[PDB]
Ligand binder design. Structure first.
Ligand SMILES: [Mg+2]
Ligand SMILES: [Mg+2]
Ligand SMILES: [Mg+2]
Ligand SMILES: [Mg+2]
Ligand SMILES: [Mg+2]
Ligand SMILES: [Mg+2]
Ligand SMILES: [Mg+2]
Ligand SMILES: [Mg+2]
Ligand SMILES: [Mg+2]
Ligand SMILES: [Mg+2]
Ligand SMILES: [Mg+2]
Ligand SMILES: [Mg+2]
Ligand SMILES: [Mg+2]
Ligand SMILES: [Mg+2]
Ligand SMILES: [Mg+2]
Ligand SMILES: [Mg+2]
Ligand SMILES: [Mg+2]
Ligand SMILES: [Mg+2]
Ligand SMILES: [Mg+2]
Ligand SMILES: [Mg+2]
Ligand SMILES: [Mg+2]
Ligand SMILES: [Mg+2]
Ligand SMILES: [Mg+2]
Ligand SMILES: [Mg+2]
Ligand SMILES: [Mg+2]
Ligand SMILES: [Mg+2]
Ligand SMILES: [Mg+2]
Ligand SMILES: [Mg+2]
Ligand SMILES: [Mg+2]
Ligand SMILES: [Mg+2]
Ligand SMILES: [Mg+2]
Ligand SMILES: [Mg+2]
Ligand SMILES: [Mg+2]
Ligand SMILES: [Mg+2]
Ligand SMILES: [Mg+2]
Ligand SMILES: [Mg+2]
Ligand SMILES: [Mg+2]
Ligand SMILES: [Mg+2]
Ligand SMILES: [Mg+2]
Ligand SMILES: [Mg+2]
Ligand SMILES: [Mg+2]
Ligand SMILES: [Mg+2]
Ligand SMILES: [Mg+2]
Ligand SMILES: [Mg+2]
Ligand SMILES: [Mg+2]
Ligand SMILES: [Mg+2]
Ligand SMILES: [Mg+2]
Ligand SMILES: [Mg+2]
Ligand SMILES: [Zn+2]
Lengths: 97, 206, 127, 63, 23, 60, 17, 83
RNA sequence: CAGGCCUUGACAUGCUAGGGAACCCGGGUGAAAGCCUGGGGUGCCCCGCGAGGGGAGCCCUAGCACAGGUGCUGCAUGGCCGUCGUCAGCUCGUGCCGUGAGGUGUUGGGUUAAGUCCCGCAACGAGCGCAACCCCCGCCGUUAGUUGCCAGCGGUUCGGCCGGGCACUCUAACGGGACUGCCCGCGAAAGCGGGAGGAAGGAGGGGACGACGUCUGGUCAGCAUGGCCCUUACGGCCUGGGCGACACACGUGCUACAAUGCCCACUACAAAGCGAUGCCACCCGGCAACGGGGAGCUAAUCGCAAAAAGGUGGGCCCAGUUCGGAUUGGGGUCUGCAACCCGACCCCAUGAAGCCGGAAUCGCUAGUAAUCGCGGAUCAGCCAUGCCGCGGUGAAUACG
């Protein structure tokens, strides 16, 4: 009973990692606190000008962060509770066995 | 030509994106087109309302466009019927369930993107450029702002020699990241070329 | 039992466990004088326990990952200096006059766009 | 294997062949230019030989 | 030297394998 | 030779080797990222605008 | 008298096509 | 060079123009745009007009021009030296 | 560029008249494009036991309005960039001085990386800049504990493999921490010299950030855009060629001329990234490129992946050489409709110049220069020795 969450901004990710943990800490028991997996980063280097000025570039990153959380004891009061929660738009969720 | 985009410079600090979602490598881009195509329609159709910020939220197989219009009377139309014929027009591009809010404007004289369009239209309508800039910057500071800067560039008055004209009041610290600078751009077509209009409103810091 | 210290120099992280005995030192299951065979800067990692004559007093079990063998040496020399004083805090003096308590924070400066390296710049010719 | 003298003879017979049929590599061998698609604007010294410097386009004067 | 495809040094340079730098 | 080639990129071609990326915003045939479908210019334009999810001027 | 640089001898026009 | 596991390459549309001639007693002056075609041992004795980007160069084929592509026998740049 | 082709056109809006379609599988010619073609069979609301005839996604034939132009003008323009220059500067409001342009402030003594800050003053304040808030790195804490870790006991096919545990290492989010705060010494003060604590000291190292302006700087070929220009063609499709030419000259680089080196075998130590017609473990065929089989991974788990300089061992013996690896012959491999022009790679053979570079000239002040390898974007493949990053090893010198 495992969930992994993914997003381009931590402060959304870190937020819905909590509000998941606690919900099964509401209908317990064992909830394995949110691990911070390593951040996978995708960069873009770009000629700053539209033409010919090659030694002037500007950088850009795109970070997907990664939080994993484990609930050891199902309690079908949370395999119910969770389905209706508050997961904002910046995040994606996968659920495991 | 030197200075960096004031908004691009404060994403993650003073400014939020205009699209919020995650998508995997396999179709981040496809979404991106819809978004750009979306604002295409709305900035096209809802210019007359005075459009200021299209906020596009995504979760999965649906969408929530939030339009920030100065006169929401034009958006919703005669009895939830305009906003409908467009919420229907959006499905024909989106395909997905296109959920469309209309959000009020705080004070239009504090929307840098608005000011820009108001000035660009005045220069589009043959008004004195220098005057229109001093007037615009007055109306902002009166609306309780902490600084304002408007910049016109092009064949002002139709002058063959292109020129830069600007006016600034209060304070505008573009090097300060805790400063909250609403930036906006408007383009103004004329019989003799095009003019760019940049409007800077300083809304206070954090 | 054990007096521990963490060590770091330059992406290299080492974990030191000072224990009493004859003097046997060991890094990653391989012996010390094995692991650093030939690398003439080896004796340098052990210099902390000579400033307190702890040489033949102790043994050391160690782990290293990150960097290279030299960065590991300066790491070990740090963690052992930290393990030593986290065996008794009177050792602090006579270990600070010799920079043993401080971390060598020199690191690989990043390469900058418009250059060949960090500061090495491309070659010029007016015309 | 075949060697010193005969190996040269076979090399020389191959090159000879290419030129006689009139193919591209054969024409590169008459003009003695590079054969394997190198640039010729600005190297080929192994294949071209010592630089035969010639005069250039005269820079206009002032005044 | 690294220009010499016919050695382990040249192969590392051109980043390939063969008789002279197998994997 | 612009619009006819914006169209001709979309076509599916006699051979798959004749398929090239073009910017979906401006139509540039050079320096196009497959991740965005954008050229390096447009990329930088929409980036500074915030219209690019989770994209952010890196600095380190 | 046609497209782009170099000029074909008529104002504005060049040699291409 | 092409993988000999794969097929020795002719465009097919030029090879049929040949075999017919062989059959109904060759030879007409055959013109093509397939510089990339390989000289095939059937072709010997014919002359093939290969386009050089500008014109169709007459090429008479002989037993020893066999390994090659037809483009090897109609060069594309005219040079004749500086001076 | 040459040739062969289309003319409301490759694409957008809208109007007509006909077929009455839609769309998906063919055939003849031709390098293809194109031209000529052959099939079947569409709702939609309808008067329907009826013959059926309308109307409507959208196709096609003609015919208009129009599309198209990477054709010109960057000296008509927007946007964005270069640059002087991260240089310490540019100004405004009111007052005061001057007939006036202007001055004052911003000058002056001291100080600072700095119009930084102190004192002085017909000036008093304010804005754009500097600094600060953002990011990476260096010490510590909290929060976490799997796919990551293994301190101390239990197994153990001896691999953290299993029990187990989250101490530690790490990962990644929120905080702390340095302030010229303290001691002395100079001084009007700002600060400056030195010391102590401390991981770090005087802005700790690095980044992002670029003032009013300059250069009628760059870009009408990314895009936008005024004006000029083309209209069976300066538009559009195609096959091929060219962008890869070569008496020559210049720039930026790669590899070297060797013994502080070159070669073979064995054996160690990184970091940042990429990866479900992708990374390819592993097994076999092949001297090899590669090929066939073939597990695992939506990836802190599986893979790219071996890092290389190093260390150990042997070989060379100062030779144009076992230095150097261009050039050419031959034989293969893969990608791709296709490698003639004009691809990378593999193996046999070949084995050029080069013995440290004339006048001249470039870079770097520390984890820097030099040296060593690794990754990514683009991309079928690749001419990348380029570029943007990553860590390994690690100097010399600064009198002035
Ligand atoms: Mg360069
Ligand atoms: Mg007119
Ligand atoms: Mg770190
Ligand atoms: Mg380095
Ligand atoms: Mg230059
Ligand atoms: Mg060439
Ligand atoms: Mg004269
Ligand atoms: Mg391609
Ligand atoms: Mg492309
Ligand atoms: Mg010319
Ligand atoms: Mg200009
Ligand atoms: Mg301009
Ligand atoms: Mg020009
Ligand atoms: Mg000045
Ligand atoms: Mg004044
Ligand atoms: Mg007066
Ligand atoms: Mg004055
Ligand atoms: Mg003063
Ligand atoms: Mg001044
Ligand atoms: Mg001054
Ligand atoms: Mg003055
Ligand atoms: Mg003065
Ligand atoms: Mg400074
Ligand atoms: Mg803990
Ligand atoms: Mg600053
Ligand atoms: Mg000019
Ligand atoms: Mg243009
Ligand atoms: Mg134009
Ligand atoms: Mg054309
Ligand atoms: Mg063509
Ligand atoms: Mg070129
Ligand atoms: Mg020269
Ligand atoms: Mg190079
Ligand atoms: Mg690789
Ligand atoms: Mg020799
Ligand atoms: Mg000689
Ligand atoms: Mg030799
Ligand atoms: Mg050799
Ligand atoms: Mg060959
Ligand atoms: Mg080729
Ligand atoms: Mg010698
Ligand atoms: Mg020298
Ligand atoms: Mg030299
Ligand atoms: Mg310096
Ligand atoms: Mg070397
Ligand atoms: Mg590389
Ligand atoms: Mg590639
Ligand atoms: Mg080449
Ligand atoms: Zn673009």
């Amino acid at each position: 009973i495992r969930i992994k969450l993914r997003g381009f901004d931590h402060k959304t990710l870190d937020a819905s990692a909590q509000k998941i943990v606690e919900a099964a800490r509401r209908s317990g028991a064992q909830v394995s606190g949110p691990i911070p997996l390593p951040t996978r980063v995708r960069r873009f280097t770009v000629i700053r000008g539209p033409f010919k000025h090659k030694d002037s570039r500007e950088h850009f990153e795109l970070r997907t962060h990664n939080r994993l959380v484990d609930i050891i004891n199902p309690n079908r009061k949370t395999i119910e509770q969770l389905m209706t929660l508050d997961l904002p738009t910046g995040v994606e969720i996968e659920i495991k066995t | 030509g030197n200075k960096i985009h004031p908004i691009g410079f404060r994403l993650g600090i003073t400014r939020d994106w205009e699209s919020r979602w995650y998508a995997g490598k396999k179709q981040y881009r496809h979404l991106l087109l819809e978004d750009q195509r979306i604002r295409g329609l709305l900035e096209k159709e809802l210019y007359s309302a005075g459009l200021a910020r299209v906020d596009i939220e995504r979760a999965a197989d649906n969408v929530a466009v939030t339009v920030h219009v100065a006169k929401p009377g034009v958006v919703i139309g005669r009895g939830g019927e305009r906003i409908r014929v467009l919420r229907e027009e959006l499905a024909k591009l989106t395909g997905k369930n296109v959920a469309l809010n209309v959000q009020e404007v705080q004070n239009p004289n504090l929307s840098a993107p608005l000011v820009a369009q108001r000035v660009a239209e005045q220069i589009e309508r043959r008004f004195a450029v220098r005057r229109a800039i001093k007037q615009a910057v007055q109306r902002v500071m009166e609306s309780g702002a902490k600084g304002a800067k408007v910049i016109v560039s092009g064949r002002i008055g139709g002058a063959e020699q292109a020129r830069t004209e600007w006016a600034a009041q209060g304070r505008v610290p573009l090097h300060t990241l805790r400063a909250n600078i609403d930036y906006g751009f408007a383009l103004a077509r004329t019989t003799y070329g095009v003019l760019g209009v940049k409007a800077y409103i300083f809304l206070g810091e954090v | 039992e054990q007096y521990y210290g963490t060590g770091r120099r330059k992406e290299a992280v080492a974990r030191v466990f000072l224990r009493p005995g004859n003097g046997k030192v060991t890094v990653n299951g391989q012996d010390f004088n094995e692991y650093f065979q030939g690398l003439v800067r080896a004796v340098a990692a052990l210099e902390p326990l000579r400033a307190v004559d702890a040489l033949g007093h102790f043994d050391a079990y160690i782990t290293v990952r990150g960097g290279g063998k030299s960065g590991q040496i300066d790491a070990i020399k740090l963690g052992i200096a930290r393990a030593l004083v986290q065996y008794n805090p009177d050792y602090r003096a006579k270990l600070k006059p010799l920079g043993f308590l401080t971390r060598d924070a020199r690191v690989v400066e990043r390469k900058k766009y418009g250059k060949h390296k960090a500061r090495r710049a491309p070659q010029y010719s007016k015309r | 294997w075949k060697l010193e003298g005969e190996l040269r003879a076979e090399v020389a017979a191959n090159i000879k062949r290419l030129m006689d049929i009139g193919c591209y590599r054969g024409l590169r061998h008459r003009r003695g230019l590079p054969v394997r698609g190198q640039r010729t604007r600005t190297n080929a010294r192994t294949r071209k030989g010592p630089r035969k410097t010639v005069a250039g386009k005269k820079k206009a004067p002032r005044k | 030297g690294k220009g010499d495809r016919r050695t382990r040094r040249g192969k590392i340079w051109r980043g390939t394998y063969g008789k002279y730098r197998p994997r | 030779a612009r619009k006819a080639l914006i169209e001709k990129a979309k076509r599916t071609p006699k051979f798959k080797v004749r398929a090239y990326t073009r910017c979906v915003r401006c139509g540039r045939a050079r320096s196009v990222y497959r991740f965005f479908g954008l050229c390096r210019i447009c990329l930088r334009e929409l980036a500074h605008k915030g219209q690019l999810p989770g994209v952010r001027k890196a600095s380190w | 008298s046609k497209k782009s640089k170099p000029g074909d001898g008529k104002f504005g026009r060049g040699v291409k096509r | 060079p092409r993988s000999l596991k794969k097929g020795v390459f002719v465009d097919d549309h030029l090879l049929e123009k040949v075999l017919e001639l062989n059959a109904k007693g060759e030879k007409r002056l055959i013109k093509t745009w397939s510089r990339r075609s390989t000289i095939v041992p059937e072709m010997v004795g014919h002359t093939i007009a290969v386009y050089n980007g500008k014109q169709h160069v007459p090429v008479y084929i002989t037993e020893n021009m066999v390994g090659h592509k037809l483009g090897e026998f109609a060069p594309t740049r005219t040079y004749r030296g500086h001076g």
